[PDB]
Design a protein around this nucleic acid. Structure first.
Ligand SMILES: *[C@H]1O[C@H](CO)[C@H](O)[C@H](O)[C@H]1NC(C)=O
Ligand SMILES: [Mg+2]
Ligand SMILES: [Mg+2]
Ligand SMILES: [Mg+2]
Ligand SMILES: [Mg+2]
Ligand SMILES: [Mg+2]
Ligand SMILES: [Mg+2]
Ligand SMILES: [Mg+2]
Ligand SMILES: [Mg+2]
Ligand SMILES: [Mg+2]
Ligand SMILES: [Mg+2]
Ligand SMILES: [Mg+2]
Ligand SMILES: [Mg+2]
Ligand SMILES: [Mg+2]
Ligand SMILES: [Mg+2]
Ligand SMILES: [Mg+2]
Ligand SMILES: [Mg+2]
Ligand SMILES: [Mg+2]
Ligand SMILES: [Mg+2]
Ligand SMILES: [Mg+2]
Ligand SMILES: [Mg+2]
Ligand SMILES: [Mg+2]
Ligand SMILES: [Mg+2]
Ligand SMILES: [Mg+2]
Ligand SMILES: [Mg+2]
Ligand SMILES: [Mg+2]
Ligand SMILES: [Mg+2]
Ligand SMILES: [Mg+2]
Ligand SMILES: [Mg+2]
Ligand SMILES: [Mg+2]
Ligand SMILES: [Mg+2]
Ligand SMILES: [Mg+2]
Ligand SMILES: [Mg+2]
Ligand SMILES: [Mg+2]
Ligand SMILES: [Mg+2]
Ligand SMILES: [Mg+2]
Ligand SMILES: [Mg+2]
Ligand SMILES: [Mg+2]
Ligand SMILES: [Mg+2]
Ligand SMILES: [Mg+2]
Ligand SMILES: [Mg+2]
Ligand SMILES: [Mg+2]
Ligand SMILES: [Mg+2]
Ligand SMILES: [Mg+2]
Ligand SMILES: [Mg+2]
Ligand SMILES: [Mg+2]
Ligand SMILES: [Mg+2]
Ligand SMILES: [Mg+2]
Ligand SMILES: [Mg+2]
Ligand SMILES: [Mg+2]
Ligand SMILES: [Mg+2]
Ligand SMILES: [Mg+2]
Ligand SMILES: [Mg+2]
Ligand SMILES: [Mg+2]
Ligand SMILES: [Mg+2]
Ligand SMILES: [Mg+2]
Ligand SMILES: [Mg+2]
Ligand SMILES: [Mg+2]
Ligand SMILES: [Mg+2]
Ligand SMILES: [Mg+2]
Ligand SMILES: [Mg+2]
Ligand SMILES: [Mg+2]
Ligand SMILES: [Mg+2]
Ligand SMILES: [Mg+2]
Ligand SMILES: [Mg+2]
Ligand SMILES: [Mg+2]
Ligand SMILES: [Mg+2]
Ligand SMILES: [Mg+2]
Lengths: 123, 118, 19, 114, 56, 209
RNA sequence: CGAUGUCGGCUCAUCACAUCCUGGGGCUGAAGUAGGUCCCAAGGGUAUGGCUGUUCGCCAUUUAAAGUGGUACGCGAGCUGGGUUUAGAACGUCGUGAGACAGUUCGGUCCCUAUCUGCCGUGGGCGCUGGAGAACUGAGGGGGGCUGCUCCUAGUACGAGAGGACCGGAGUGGACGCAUCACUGGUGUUCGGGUUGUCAUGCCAAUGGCACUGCCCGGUAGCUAAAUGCGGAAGAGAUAAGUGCUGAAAGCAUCUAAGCACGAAACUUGCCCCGAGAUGAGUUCUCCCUGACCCUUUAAGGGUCCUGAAGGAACGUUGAAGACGACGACGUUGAUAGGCCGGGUGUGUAAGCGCAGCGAUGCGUUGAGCUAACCGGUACUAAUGAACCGUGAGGCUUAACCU
RNA sequence: AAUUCCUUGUCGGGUAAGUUCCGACCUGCACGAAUGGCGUAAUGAUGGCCAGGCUGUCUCCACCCGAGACUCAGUGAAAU
RNA sequence: ACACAGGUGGUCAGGUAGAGAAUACCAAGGCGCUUGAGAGAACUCGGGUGAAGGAACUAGGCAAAAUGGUGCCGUAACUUC
RNA sequence: AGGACCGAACCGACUAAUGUUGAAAAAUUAGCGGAUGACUUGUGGCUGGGGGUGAAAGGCCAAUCAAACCGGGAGAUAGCU
C-alpha cells in the first residue's frame, strides 16, 4: 500500500538502495500501489559505481509491501519492509540481472516473468 | 450508536462506577433491601447476583475473589455464611426491583432492590 | 427608562478595516 | 446460529493437529500453475492463533532471504494441505508480535520439555 | 442571531400547542389494601400486587 | 419471476475444492404461503400476497386473523406482495418453497439497512473534515458553506446535510446464488445483504440479468 | 458611509455552454494510425506535487480529460488570516523636520446561544364522511448515468514500407456510490495478564485504591476501512446534428411540400429510493358495533339511562430502532430484559497446597483460573387482575339492478 | 542586501520539480565608513532555509473515554 | 459589583520513594467545590489508541508526536581559548 | 568566581487551544523565559497635569492618557445631523 512520498527498499542489484514513490500510475486520483502495480520513483540513495544515479526519475514494480497481499481463501502474506524492482521509462523491463528476497504470485503475468525466474522463492 | 452494547455509563467515569457499585453491592448484602434510582438498581443486579452465585461454592479462592470485589470482610462472610446456602437451590434471580415513585429533590425514578427471601 | 451605559469593555474581534 | 453452526461443522477439517503460539510448524500449501498442482512448504514460528471455528486462522513468521515474512493461514482452507509441529516453543503470551522487533540471538525461544 | 421582528402572542401560543401535560391514564387499585397507586409501583403504605413488601 | 421472503441468519464462508473462500449471507427462506391473489378485474394488477414464519395467536389482531382464515393458511410474521409476469399463475394456500431459486444464477436482496441514527455530513455524505489544527476554530467536522450569497439567497432542496442515516429499504442487485438447500430451507448468496441478523429479506431473481 | 467585511486558501457547492474528456456527425491538403476544422450534444466525469500569500504562472510527474464562465470576482452570523488593512521597529528613498512611499523588511486581535425565510432530518394535530387492522396502486419527486488498459476479431482492412484500424465480442482496473462485517485489520478506559512508585486490607501470602486506563502487552461483542460483495447497463420510445427513400411544386433535379426510414452519454422510459395532505386525500382484503327513552328553537338537533365492540393508547420488560417523539419485539396461554446453566471467545498455566533451590524464582497439581456487550438453553427476578380511549349499523340527491 | 524598481536578474548548489534558502557575479533603480563600514566566537520564547528522528498535520479518517449538546424535575437570563 | 476558576506579605514543614520545598502515593488535618436524575445522536470541548504511508498538511511541522535519568566511554567546524 | 549552567518557590508572558452575553472588563489549560541579580517582595515615604515619571512603547500617572480626574467659566460654539 504505497503512495507519493513512500520510501521503498530495492529488491534488485541496480545499485539503488532507497527510492521514493513520486507517482502511482494508471488512474486519475489513484491513491495506492500494491504488489504488481507500477509506480514512478526518484532514487534517494545509490552505490557510487552503479547502473543508476541518485536523483534519477524512472519506473519500479512494487514486489513486497508491509500491508501485503490477500489470496482467494482469505489468507494474507505480509513482509517487514516495502521493496520494488527498478524498470525503464520506455520498455518497463528490469535494469538489474539479480532480484533479492522473495516475491508473490501476483507478478505471474507476461510483463514481470524476469522478476519470477530470477527470484529465489515465490510466495 | 451503541448497537448490542451493555453497561450504563450513569454520567460517571469507569473508576467511579466500579467504586459506587462496590459500595452499593455491600449496602444491599448488609441491609438486604435498599432504595436507589431505578437505572442504578437495574445495573446493581449485574454486580450483586454474580457475588451471590460465586458465594454458592465456599473455597479460599472464591472468598478472595469476592474480597477482590466488595473489599469488605463483613460482606464476604455474609455472602459465604448467610446468603450462599439461602439461595443454594435458586437458579439466579436473587434480587427483586420494586418501583416506588419519584425522589423529591430531582424527580429521579426510584426503586427498592431487595434479596428475594428477605 | 434605560440604565447608565458601561465604560468600554474588551472586544472579541477587530472591526474589519475597509480601505 | 444452529443453522450457521450446521454449515460451519461440515466444511471443518477433523485432522488439525495441536499447535501453540511459539511452536515451529511446517504448513504445506497447494500452488496452482494452470494444470500442475504442487505442494510449497512454509516453515516458521506461530506468532498468533485465531480460534473461531471454521474461521480459525494462525500467523506464521519466517526470515526468508534477509526480509521477514508473515503468512496468515485460514486453518480450514483446502489450500492448506498439512500442518506439522517441527519444534515446541516455551512462551507465556498468546500473541508473539514482540518477535517482529528482534533479530538473531534475541529472536530465539526456549524448547518446551513435556 | 436574533429576531428582526417581535414574534406575536399568536405565534407564542402556537409553539406552546405541544407543551400541555398528559394526566396519568388511570391509577391501579391494589387487591389487598385497596389503595390507588401508579401501575407497576408500590402503594403509599408499601403494598404491591396484594403483598406487604416494605414495613411503613 | 416472483421473489421469496426470508430471514438474514448471518454471514459464513464456503471453501471451494479449488481453494477459494466465498463470503456468503445465509438466508432462511421457509415456506411462503400465498394469502391472496390480485387480478386485473377486482384489484387492478397481477400479484400474489405471501406470508411466512409463525406468530403468537394473541398478537394476531382479528382483522389480520380473518384475512389468513379466508386464505386457509396459518398466520405469518407479515404480508408481502410480488408482481406476476404474463405467464405466471398461483392459487390460494399454495406453499411456495426455496426450490423456486433452483436454476436462478443471480438474485436481488432487498432489506432494511442497519440504523446509524442521526449521522453527521462526514459519515452520511462522505464530506471531507476541515483542518484538525492550523487555527481551525470549532469547525473540524462541520459541513462548511451550505450555499452562495444574495443570489440565490436560499439553500437548494437536496442539499447534503446531517440527518437520519440507514434504517431504510436498500436493494443490493446481482448477487451470485452459491447454494439452494431445500431440506434446511436455506439460500446462500455471495457477499453482504442489507440489515441486522434476524432482519426480513425479500429475494427476487436478477432484474438486470 | 446611524458599516453591504475586503485578496488567496479551506469546506460545501449550484447554474450556463462559447465542450476539456467520453457520445453522434459533415468537410478534409481524411490511405491507415493520428490529426485539422465546423456542426450536434451539458448525462456523467474533469490531477497530485515543488516555488510563491498568491489567483495566476513556471516547473516535475500524472490523466480519458486536468474545460471556459456566472453565482456579492459563490461561500469569514461556515473555518483560516499568509496577502492586504491601525498602533512597534528598521532599510532604501524623499523631506530642514514632524513624517512619508500602490517601495521593502520583522512583529502584530477574526464576536454572535438562530426569531423568520431556506435547507436536512423527525414527530404531534386534524383531514380524507361509521369506526378499525393490514396489503397495495403510483400521480408526482428524488438517486443513479464517469472511464482506462489488456486480449480476441487481426498483424486482418489500409499501406511502398514504417506502421496499423472501423464494426463486434471478452476480461481486468482507476475514480465514485450503496451495503456489509464472513475474512484481513483498527478500536475495544465494561475481558485477561505483565509491571513501576505508594497507601491500605493486623502481618505473611493474597488483593484493592491512586498515579493519563499509572505505564504497558494482548483482546470479546459492537462500531468500523485499509476489509469484500454489489452498482453505472442492456433494451425500448421520441429525437439532435447528420444520413437517406419515394416525390412534385419546377417535364429535369431535389431528404420534403404529401408520404416513408435511420440517427447520440442529451430527452421519455428502463434500474434504485420516497411517495394518496395525489384535499384530484385512490384501490383491495379482513374485522367490529343490529339497545331503550324523553324534550324541542323538528335539526346531519340536544339529553338521560343502558352499553364500551373491533382496535388503540397507557403502563411494564425491552431492541443491531432511536436526540426526544417515532419504529420493532415481548408482558405468565411468557424467552422481552437481567440473572442462571452449558458452550464459545479472550487472556495464558489462578489461589491454595506440595516439591527443588541459601534465595530470587522454577516445577507439579494445570492449558489452570478468570472471562463484557457473543451462541444455545432455562421462568429464578421483573414484565399484574384491572382501569383508560374508542361505540351502538353510519347524511342527502340521482341513477342502474333488486322486491 | 532588513537596501535591487526592472526581477522569479544571471550562473552554480540543494529538490523529481525551489518566486524562498545558500554561494558566486556586479547591471549598487536608490550600500558605504561612530544617524558608523566590514567581520566576529558566544548568546537569542529573534527572521529565513535544509536534514535525521517523530508523528492523525495530511492521504482519510475509524473507534474509544470523559464534559456539554438531547430527555425529565427545580431555578431561570440576553442581544434584538 | 457575585458565596466570582483571578489578586494578596509573613510563619510552621510528618512518612515512603526522590537530588529536592520537584513529582507520585499517604499522615496530622481538611475537603467532594449549593442544581440534580437519565440518555449514550449530530456537533463542540478535553483526552486515549490506530492498518499502510510519514510533512504528501500548511503561509509556516501550527498543533501533535518525539527526546528526556544516572554512570562510564566518546565528542566536529569554529573560537575572543 | 559568575548580570555562569539545569531547575521548584518567586518574578515574568513566546506559542497554541479554550473562553469572547467569559469562571475572568485581560483569564484558564498545556507547553514557555528569568530564577544571586541591571533580581524579587512587604511596609512607609517623595515626584502632580503642558506637569510628573519613563533601560523610550507616546509607555505609565486609580479598569481613564498625543495632556488625568473633579468642580467651575457653561446653556462654550455647532453655516452640521
Ligand atoms: C476589540 O476591538 C477594540 C476596538 O474597539 C480593539 O481593536 C481590540 O483590540 C479588539 N480586540 C480583539 C480581540 O479583536
Ligand atoms: Mg443486549
Ligand atoms: Mg448530568
Ligand atoms: Mg484512574
Ligand atoms: Mg422610554
Ligand atoms: Mg431591518
Ligand atoms: Mg414546547
Ligand atoms: Mg441503530
Ligand atoms: Mg482533506
Ligand atoms: Mg477564538
Ligand atoms: Mg478544535
Ligand atoms: Mg426570491
Ligand atoms: Mg442600519
Ligand atoms: Mg453548442
Ligand atoms: Mg439538462
Ligand atoms: Mg437519460
Ligand atoms: Mg503548482
Ligand atoms: Mg472566485
Ligand atoms: Mg467573493
Ligand atoms: Mg476569507
Ligand atoms: Mg457569509
Ligand atoms: Mg496577515
Ligand atoms: Mg509606525
Ligand atoms: Mg467566526
Ligand atoms: Mg437526478
Ligand atoms: Mg462477528
Ligand atoms: Mg485485532
Ligand atoms: Mg487496548
Ligand atoms: Mg485490567
Ligand atoms: Mg505482601
Ligand atoms: Mg487512597
Ligand atoms: Mg491522593
Ligand atoms: Mg440506449
Ligand atoms: Mg422527381
Ligand atoms: Mg433471559
Ligand atoms: Mg482458549
Ligand atoms: Mg493474578
Ligand atoms: Mg523584488
Ligand atoms: Mg520541502
Ligand atoms: Mg536556480
Ligand atoms: Mg545571496
Ligand atoms: Mg545606511
Ligand atoms: Mg566620516
Ligand atoms: Mg550598528
Ligand atoms: Mg428544564
Ligand atoms: Mg459556589
Ligand atoms: Mg504570592
Ligand atoms: Mg507538589
Ligand atoms: Mg460522547
Ligand atoms: Mg473527542
Ligand atoms: Mg496519542
Ligand atoms: Mg497510523
Ligand atoms: Mg504502524
Ligand atoms: Mg520515516
Ligand atoms: Mg508541502
Ligand atoms: Mg498543498
Ligand atoms: Mg510546536
Ligand atoms: Mg506531547
Ligand atoms: Mg544566571
Ligand atoms: Mg512587563
Ligand atoms: Mg502557565
Ligand atoms: Mg538561564
Ligand atoms: Mg533556570
Ligand atoms: Mg510612534
Ligand atoms: Mg490605566
Ligand atoms: Mg490640550
Ligand atoms: Mg461664557
Ligand atoms: Mg451645549
Amino acid at each position: 500500500m504505497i503512495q507519493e512520498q513512500t520510501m521503498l527498499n530495492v529488491a534488485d542489484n541496480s545499485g539503488a538502495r532507497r527510492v521514493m514513490c513520486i507517482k502511482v500510475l494508471g488512474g486519475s486520483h489513484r491513491r495506492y500501489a500494491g504488489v504488481g502495480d507500477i509506480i514512478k520513483i526518484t532514487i534517494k540513495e545509490a552505490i557510487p559505481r552503479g547502473k543508476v544515479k541518485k536523483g534519477d526519475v524512472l519506473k519500479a514494480v512494487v514486489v513486497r509491501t508491509k500491508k501485503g497481499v490477500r489470496r482467494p481463501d482469505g489468507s494474507v502474506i505480509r513482509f517487514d519492509g516495502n521493496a520494488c524492482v527498478l524498470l525503464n521509462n520506455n520498455s518497463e523491463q528490469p535494469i538489474g540481472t539479480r532480484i533479492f528476497g522473495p516475491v508473490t504470485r501476483e507478478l505471474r503475468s507476461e510483463k514481470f516473468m524476469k522478476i519470477i525466474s530470477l527470484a529465489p522463492e515465490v510466495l | 450508536m451503541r448497537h448490542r452494547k451493555s453497561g450504563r455509563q450513569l454520567n460517571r467515569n469507569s473508576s467511579h462506577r466500579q467504586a459506587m457499585f462496590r459500595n452499593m453491592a455491600g449496602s444491599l448484602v448488609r441491609h438486604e433491601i435498599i432504595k436507589t434510582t431505578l437505572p442504578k438498581a437495574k445495573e446493581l443486579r449485574r454486580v450483586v447476583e454474580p457475588l451471590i452465585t460465586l458465594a454458592k461454592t465456599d473455597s479460599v479462592a472464591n472468598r478472595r475473589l469476592a474480597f477482590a470485589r466488595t473489599r469488605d470482610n463483613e460482606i464476604v462472610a455474609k455472602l459465604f455464611n448467610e446468603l450462599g446456602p439461602r439461595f443454594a437451590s435458586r437458579a439466579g434471580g436473587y434480587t427483586r426491583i420494586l418501583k416506588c415513585g419519584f425522589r423529591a429533590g430531582d424527580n429521579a425514578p426510584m426503586a427498592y432492590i431487595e434479596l428475594v427471601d428477605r | 427608562g434605560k440604565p447608565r451605559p458601561y465604560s468600554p469593555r474588551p472586544t472579541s474581534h477587530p472591526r474589519p478595516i475597509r480601505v | 446460529s444452529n443453522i450457521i453452526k450446521q454449515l460451519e461443522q461440515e466444511q471443518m477439517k477433523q485432522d488439525v493437529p495441536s499447535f501453540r503460539p511459539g511452536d515451529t510448524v511446517e504448513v504445506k500449501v497447494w500452488v496452482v500453475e494452470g494444470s500442475k498442482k504442487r505442494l510449497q512448504a512454509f516453515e516458521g514460528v506461530v506468532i498468533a492463533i485465531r480460534n473461531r471455528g471454521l474461521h480459525s486462522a494462525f500467523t506464521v513468521r519466517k526470515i526468508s532471504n534477509g526480509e521477514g515474512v508473515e503468512r496468515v493461514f485460514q486453518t480450514h482452507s483446502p489450500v492448506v494441505d498439512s500442518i506439522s509441529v517441527k519444534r515446541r516453543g516455551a512462551v507465556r503470551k498468546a500473541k508473539l508480535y514482540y518477535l517482529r522487533e528482534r533479530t538473531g540471538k534475541a529472536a530465539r525461544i526456549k524448547e518446551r520439555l513435556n | 442571531a436574533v429576531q428582526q421582528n417581535k414574534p406575536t402572542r399568536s405565534k407564542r401560543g402556537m409553539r406552546r400547542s405541544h407543551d400541555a401535560l398528559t394526566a396519568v391514564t388511570s391509577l391501579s387499585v391494589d387487591k389487598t389494601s385497596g389503595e390507588k397507586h401508579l401501575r407497576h409501583h408500590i402503594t403509599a403504605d408499601g403494598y404491591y400486587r396484594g403483598r406487604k413488601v416494605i414495613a411503613k | 419471476m416472483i421473489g421469496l421472503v426470508g430471514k438474514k441468519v448471518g454471514m459464513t464462508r464456503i471453501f471451494t475444492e479449488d481453494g477459494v473462500s466465498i463470503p456468503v449471507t445465509v438466508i432462511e427462506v421457509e415456506a411462503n404461503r400465498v394469502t391472496q391473489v390480485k387480478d386485473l378485474a377486482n384489484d387492478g394488477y397481477r400479484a400474489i400476497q405471501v406470508t411466512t414464519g409463525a406468530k403468537k395467536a394473541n398478537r394476531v389482531t382479528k382483522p389480520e386473523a380473518g384475512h389468513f382464515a379466508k386464505a386457509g393458511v396459518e398466520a405469518g410474521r407479515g404480508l408481502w406482495e410480488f408482481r406476476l409476469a404474463e405467464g405466471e399463475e398461483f392459487t390460494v394456500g399454495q406453499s411456495i418453497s426455496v426450490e423456486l431459486f433452483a436454476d436462478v444464477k443471480k438474485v436481488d436482496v432487498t432489506g432494511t439497512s442497519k440504523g446509524k441514527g442521526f449521522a453527521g455530513t462526514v459519515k452520511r455524505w462522505n464530506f471531507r473534515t476541515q483542518d484538525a489544527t492550523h487555527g481551525n476554530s470549532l469547525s473540524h467536522r462541520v459541513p462548511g458553506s451550505i450555499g452562495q450569497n444574495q443570489t440565490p439567497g436560499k439553500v437548494f432542496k437536496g442539499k447534503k446535510m446531517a440527518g437520519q442515516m440507514g434504517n431504510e429499504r436498500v436493494t443490493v442487485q446481482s448477487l451470485d446464488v452459491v447454494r439452494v438447500d431445500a431440506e434446511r430451507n436455506l439460500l446462500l448468496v455471495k457477499g453482504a445483504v442489507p440489515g441486522a441478523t434476524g432482519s426480513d429479506l425479500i429475494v427476487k431473481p436478477a432484474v438486470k440479468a
